[PDB]
Design a protein around this nucleic acid. Structure first.
Ligand SMILES: O=c1ccn([C@H]2C[C@H](O)[C@@H](COP(=O)(O)NP(=O)(O)OP(=O)(O)O)O2)c(=O)[nH]1
Ligand SMILES: [Cl-]
Ligand SMILES: [Cl-]
Ligand SMILES: [Mg+2]
Ligand SMILES: [Mg+2]
Ligand code: NA
Ligand code: NA
Ligand code: NA
Ligand code: NA
Ligand code: NA
Length: 327
DNA sequence: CGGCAGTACTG
DNA sequence: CAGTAC
DNA sequence: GCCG
């Protein structure tokens, strides 16, 4: 279980010659849509990254959780020969599929369709492809959404959101989660969680907050924002700080009831692989873990989780600080 | 043999 | 719903 | 791809 161990085990990778090659195959399977095969590669890569020493034998590889017969044979190949033959036999469509699936709002199905239709470049997409509203925004910001910002800029973005929120309710709590809370030096976006400790004033704040951030010109595009019926949980969009030298940055906001704060904070801090491991563990124990609650198997019972530590405790896991969840 | 996390928008 | 995303 |  990745979630049972500190992610600092990957800081010293004794198998990088192997993992940098498996990573190429993992991405090739992912963009072609073979999600489960790609998942097995991703888990094997993490297992090899955390292992305490270089793997040197077939029996040694198979003994590692996440590494089976097939993955062992690839490891043996890279050790003996220095190369992996399959890397010379990846589908020729893969670079273009990767190019296309890096448009926000286009995944493997859209990328494969565009490839079948004869498109090979973003110029082809721009000039000939049918784009959803989201995809057109993704394409307009193609390079910007592939950039990571310095964490200092993420702080400024969080502060912009926080000041706008607290201006109409001074009791609102705002926390930047994701890679920022995990202590990374750069951030792909800013993930802001908003709640209110009184348990009720979080309701209806999206309309006021988004209007405020629009009034000051900070939000530039909206990707996901269901503003019609008042039940909105998330905003996914684009912002830009004022002044020269600024880039468009992705911004995600969630507003959660205080009763769900610990589970929402745990979810939104991640990492994604950490969450998936923790959720899979919870299931083996007759529980279910989401961004709303830790509950028993089904209508199940909601377990009491006032803090993140309580979730770890109820799953039998030692607590990990956010920086140690970077799987 | 079949799951592989659990959930929220979009159209 | 399938697709996509956090 | 891996796992129970
Ligand atoms: O598939 C996912 C993706 C994200 N998440 C959670 C964990 C993640 O840390 C958080 C924010 O998602 P981001 O896509 O913003 N990733 P993160 O902030 O970890 O890294 P970065 O934004 O720097 O790429 O949402 C999941 O649970 N499942
Ligand atoms: Cl291939
Ligand atoms: Cl907490
Ligand atoms: Mg993020
Ligand atoms: Mg995000
Ligand atoms: Na290691
Ligand atoms: Na194994
Ligand atoms: Na995409
Ligand atoms: Na909308
Ligand atoms: Na599954």
């Amino acid at each position: 279980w990745v979630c049972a161990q500190p992610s600092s085990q990957k800081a010293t990778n004794h198998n990088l010659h192997i993992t940098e090659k498996l990573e190429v195959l993992a991405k090739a399977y992912s963009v072609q849509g073979d999600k489960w095969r790609a998942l097995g590669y991703a888990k094997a890569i993490n297992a090899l990254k955390s292992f305490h020493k270089p793997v040197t034998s077939y029996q040694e590889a198979c003994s590692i959780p996440g590494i089976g017969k097939r993955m062992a044979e690839k490891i043996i190949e890279i050790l003996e020969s220095g190369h992996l033959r399959k890397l010379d036999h990846i589908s020729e469509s893969v670079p273009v599929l990767e190019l296309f699936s890096n448009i926000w709002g286009a995944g493997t199905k859209t990328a494969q369709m565009w490839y079948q239709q004869g498109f090979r470049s973003l110029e082809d997409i721009r000039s000939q492809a049918s784009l959803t509203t989201q995809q057109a925004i993704g394409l307009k910001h193609y390079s910007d959404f592939l950039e990571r910002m310095p964490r200092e800029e993420a702080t400024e973005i969080e502060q912009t959101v926080q000041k706008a929120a607290q201006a109409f309710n001074s009791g609102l709590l705002c926390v930047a989660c994701g890679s920022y809370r995990r202590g990374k030096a750069t951030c792909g976006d800013v993930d802001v969680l908003i709640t209110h400790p009184d348990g009720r004033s979080h309701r209806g704040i999206f309309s006021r907050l988004l209007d405020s951030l629009r009034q000051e010109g900070f939000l530039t595009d909206d990707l996901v924002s269901q503003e019609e019926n008042g039940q909105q949980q998330k905003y996914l969009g684009v912002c830009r700080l004022p002044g020269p030298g600024r880039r468009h940055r992705r911004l995600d906001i969630i507003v959660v009831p205080y009763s769900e704060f610990a589970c929402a904070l745990l979810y939104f801090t991640g990492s994604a692989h950490f969450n998936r491991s923790m959720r899979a563990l919870a299931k083996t124990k007759g529980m279910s873990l989401s961004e709303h609650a830790l509950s028993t198997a089904v209508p199940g019972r909601v377990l009491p989780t006032p803090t993140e530590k309580d979730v770890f405790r109820l799953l039998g896991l030692p607590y990990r600080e956010p920086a140690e969840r970077d799987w």
